[PDB]
Curated annotation (Swiss-Prot):
Chain's role: Part of a multicomponent enzyme which catalyzes the degradation of phenol and some of its methylated derivatives. DmpM is a regulatory subunit that stimulates the phenol hydroxylase activity of the complex. The steady-state rate of phenol hydroxylase turnover is dependent on the DmpM concentration, with a maximum observed rate at about 1.5 DmpM per oxygenase monomer. Higher concentrations of DmpM inhibit phenol hydroxylase activity. May act by altering the redox potential of the oxygenase. Required for growth on phenol and for in vitro phenol hydroxylase activity.
Gene Ontology terms describing biological process: phenol-containing compound catabolic process
Keyword list, A-Z: Aromatic hydrocarbons catabolism, Monooxygenase, NAD, Oxidoreductase, Plasmid
Protein name, as recorded: Phenol 2-monooxygenase, stimulatory component DmpM
Length: 90
């Protein structure tokens, strides 16, 4: 009842509020920023396999598009050999 994470993103000006109505739809999603970007928070840990690192690999040529909008997830990022996992982590 404490370990929490957080993910954020900064799209244009409307698409953002849209995702805001979705997270609010759930009576658990948290909120942090509003005007500038839209951050998020969770309460536990996260885990991802190398399969995802494979997608970003073929999509690593989108950094320019990642510049305009902002991105954030969980909070930290622990990686072992090829797999990738991240939980609350302050």
């Amino acid at each position: 009842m404490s370990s929490l994470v957080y993910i954020a993103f900064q799209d244009n000006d409307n698409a953002r509020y849209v995702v805001e109505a979705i997270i609010q739809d759930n009576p658990h999603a948290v909120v942090q920023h509003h005007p500038a970007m839209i951050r998020i928070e969770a309460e536990k840990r996260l885990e991802i396999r190398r399969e995802t690192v494979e997608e970003n690999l073929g999509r690593a040529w989108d950094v320019q598009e990642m510049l305009v909008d902002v991105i954030t997830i969980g909070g930290n990022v622990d990686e072992d050999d090829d797999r990738f996992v991240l939980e609350w982590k302050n």
